[PDB]
């Protein structure tokens, strides 16, 4: 959801990093420029994106790390997100993390997907 993006910008702005956001609220002219700006060597540590908008077809080789706050579907759709990072132009190993809470719905999702070998999920009840 896009309501996490502004809070994340107020956070990254609180800790004072260099970031660029790409989502459905941007234009087409500021997209490729914010892309090439991240791919080329620069001081930007974190690059914020969205699942549907910029997490699908882009080329970015710059980042060595992928972070997932929340994942609804990950047979495929979420696999594309970290595959946006790992590309042909990456000589460094990709460390992909995941954020899972404790004793929550997200904690039950991967626990039910580990026993069933992660095919597809239907109903979460526990």
């Amino acid at each position: 959801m896009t309501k996490v993006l502004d809070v994340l910008e107020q956070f990254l702005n609180y800790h004072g990093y260099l970031y660029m956001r790409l989502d459905g609220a941007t234009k087409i002219e500021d997209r490729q420029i914010l892309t090439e700006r991240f791919n080329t060597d620069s001081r930007i540590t974190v690059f914020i994106l969205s699942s549907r908008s910029g997490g699908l077809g882009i080329n970015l080789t710059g980042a060595d790390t992928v972070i997932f706050y929340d994942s609804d579907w990950n047979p495929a759709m979420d696999k594309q997100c970290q595959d946006r990072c790992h590309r042909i132009g990456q000589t460094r190993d990709v460390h992909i993390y995941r954020f899972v809470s404790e004793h929550t719905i997200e904690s039950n999702i991967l626990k039910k997907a580990n026993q069933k070998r992660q095919l597809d999920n239907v109903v979460i009840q526990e």
């Binding site: 996490v4 929340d70 719905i105």
Partner: peptide, 18 residues
Amino acid sequence: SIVNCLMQLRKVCNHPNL
């Protein structure tokens, strides 16, 4: 109703967006 009921928990765990 299931999805719309879970979107509130997903609107909590990440951040108190509730």
